[PDB]
Amino acid sequence: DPEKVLEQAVIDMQEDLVQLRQAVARTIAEEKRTEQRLNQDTQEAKKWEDRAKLALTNGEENLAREALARKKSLTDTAAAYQTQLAQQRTMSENLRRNLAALEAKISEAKTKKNMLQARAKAAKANAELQQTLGGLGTSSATSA
């Protein structure tokens, strides 16, 4: 019957919203992790720059060039992680809007189906009442 079918659909939606919430939480965690990684890498680059300055103090131009290489690697990694974070943010916003839309769909479908079923039941009850009013059988005493 349609009652059971739509009822099961509502129940499945109850699980789907939780699944999407879990996905959103995972995306939040991923973006936080990449933010931390890029943020610490930027500081490692500054530390290597300080080592380069120490080299500039006297002599070790080789140490300065090594520190420059470390800086280049770190900044490239930071740019890559920034791009990854942008992708994660875009995905998070997409999933957030999808969750909002899905919640709206679920709520509207559930409430509309429930009210429709209730009104149909009321209408059929009223029709049955009218039939019974027209279906009175007390006239059978005409036989007696």
């Binding site: 919430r21 959103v24 939480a25 995306t27 939040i28 965690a29 991923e30 973006e31 936080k32």
Partner: protein
């Protein structure tokens, strides 16, 4: 120390998972609090 850092990263991931759901109308509720604070400030100015 590495193991302790992984735990911290897990905490940050949990914070992100909370933030993705942290969007609440309480932000709009906070405007009412600021309006009430301004009203009390206006009343205090009247007292002067």
């Amino acid at each position: 120390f590495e193991r302790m850092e992984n735990k911290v990263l897990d905490m940050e991931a949990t914070s992100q998972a909370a933030g993705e759901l942290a969007g609440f109308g309480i932000e709009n509720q906070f405007a009412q609090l600021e309006a009430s604070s301004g009203v009390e400030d206006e009343l205090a100015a009247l007292k002067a």
